Write a protein that binds this ligand. Structure first.
Ligand code: CU
Ligand code: CU
Ligand code: CU
Ligand code: O
Ligand code: O
Length: 476
């Protein structure tokens, strides 16, 4: 059979009441011919791409048609805590919440997803995620590929696993609280190995790793390069040519890739050195999508310069905040041994060469920051507004992957896990790798967040977030 075409999320803009309507609901999807209950925004699975313009405000009306509580967070968008949609931003089942977003940051591909307390991993796994396309005046002058669904395409890559009856098989248990929820089936905008027909010339891909726990590493099947033009928070100063592009959970990059007549090629993900993630079929390069060239000229450009990146300031005299991540040693070893028992030595491929004892030992609060599992009632500190800070995040003490995300900002990485950041990671980021080492980022918060609607900072390995590896903080 031919491959299905890559599904393209609808690009949604406001009505004359300046409103965008998002309905959160359950429906059905099909994967490998078997139906599964799934959740979506304005549909059965995934969600639309909300289009925003710098300097314009939009109101979003969010209708929760699930039978459980949820929240809606705009990952990458810098907004006041009251509309950030962290775990305090509850939307009752059958209820509606509206937020007004006053967009105040450069053009970027951001995304949105649930942030329900202790249940974010399940709600993402069931299907909820959407996109945000921010434009500003600067980016349109560059004449990048811009025809949505033709030469400018979002690529949301996610794994799932399913039970024998076809349903999504999600469990937050000791093994996944240790290693994360991951599966054996790769989805690309919800579809298994789709094709996308693209015109000859440049193709812009807005890549999102939407997996709960799996890191990815994109490349092409015939080793043509990817030209990185943007990271989480917007354009780089100039394109950065790469042969492979590691992407952590929740990160975005936009790349341009050449499309040549008569030569289809795949976007692939290459095996990663992360526990559990190189079990078949991920022990080998895995196709994500086939690009099918069409013999019609594509109009977009890859300009020499994209934007101005300001200089890092002096670090002297900046507040230094220490964030020590930790996992419970006994429960990390138990979960890792369950993984090994299940899959054997392949569960560590690529890596460097039973009774109830009560609430004290419960894995639901095993993961922590500064010795505390997330306490929604007690923000850990009060950050400065409009002031740079140096946040130092340590994963010393364990070797698991912690893509560390901070709400309310786009930051600059000073050190990523003990090395200066790669050039394509040296611009605006909202995620930094922490794995067995220490990262340092330079952050500034331009908006307030009170205790009742605090900003979060957490690992975006969702099963770790949901079992305590998150803190709240206020601004202003
Ligand atoms: Cu996120
Ligand atoms: Cu976020
Ligand atoms: Cu978050
Ligand atoms: O987030
Ligand atoms: O998040």
């Amino acid at each position: 059979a031919e491959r299905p075409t890559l599904p393209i999320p609808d690009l949604l803009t406001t009505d004359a009441r300046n409103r965008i309507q998002l309905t959160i609901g359950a429906g059905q999807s099909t994967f490998g011919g078997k139906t599964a209950t799934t959740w979506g925004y304005n549909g059965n699975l995934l969600g639309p791409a909300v289009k925003l313009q710098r300097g314009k405000a939009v109101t979003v009306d969010i209708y929760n048609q699930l039978t459980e509580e949820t929240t809606l967070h705009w990952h990458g968008l810098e907004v006041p805590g009251e509309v950030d949609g962290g775990p305090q931003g509850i939307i009752p089942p059958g209820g509606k919440r509206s937020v007004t977003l006053n967009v105040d940051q450069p053009a970027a591909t951001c995304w949105f997803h649930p942030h329900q307390h202790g249940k974010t991993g399940r709600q993402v796994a069931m299907g909820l995620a959407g996109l945000v396309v921010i434009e500003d005046d600067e980016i349109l002058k560059l004449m990048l590929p811009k025809q949505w669904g033709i030469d400018d395409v979002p690529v949301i890559v996610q794994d799932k696993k399913f039970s024998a009856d076809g349903q999504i098989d999600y469990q937050l248990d000791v093994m996944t609280a240790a290693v994360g929820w991951f599966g054996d089936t790769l989805l690309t905008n919800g579809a298994i190995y789709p094709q996308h027909a693209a015109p000859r010339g440049w193709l812009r891909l807005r890549l999102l790793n939407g997996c709960n726990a799996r890191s990815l590493n994109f490349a092409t099947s015939d080793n043509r390069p990817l030209y990185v033009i943007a990271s989480d928070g917007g354009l780089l100063p100039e394109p950065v040519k790469v042969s492979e592009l590691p992407v952590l959970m929740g990160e975005r990059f936009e790349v341009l890739v050449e499309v040549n007549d008569n030569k289809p090629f795949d976007l692939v993900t290459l095996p990663v050195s992360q526990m559990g993630m190189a079990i078949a079929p991920f022990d080998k390069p895995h196709p994500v999508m086939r690009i099918q060239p069409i013999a019609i000229s594509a109009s977009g450009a890859l300009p020499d310069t994209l934007s101005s990146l300001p200089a890092l300031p002096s670090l002297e005299g900046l507040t230094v905040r220490k964030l020590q991540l930790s996992m419970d040693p006994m429960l990390d070893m138990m979960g890792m041994q369950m993984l090994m028992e299940k899959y054997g030595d392949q569960a560590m491929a690529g890596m460097d060469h039973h009774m109830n004892h009560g609430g004290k030992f419960d894995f639901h609060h095993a993961n922590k920051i500064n010795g505390q599992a997330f306490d929604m009632n007690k923000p850990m500190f009060a950050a400065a507004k409009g002031q740079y800070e140096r946040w130092v995040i340590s994963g010393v003490g364990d070797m698991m992957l912690h893509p560390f995300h901070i709400h309310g900002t786009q930051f600059r990485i000073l050190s990523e896990n003990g090395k200066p950041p790669a050039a394509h990671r040296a611009g605006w980021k909202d995620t930094v790798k922490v794995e067995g080492n220490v990262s340092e980022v330079l952050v500034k918060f331009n908006h307030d967040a009170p205790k009742e609607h605090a900003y979060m900072a957490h690992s975006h390995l969702l099963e770790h977030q949901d079992t305590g590896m998150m803190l709240g903080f206020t601004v202003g």
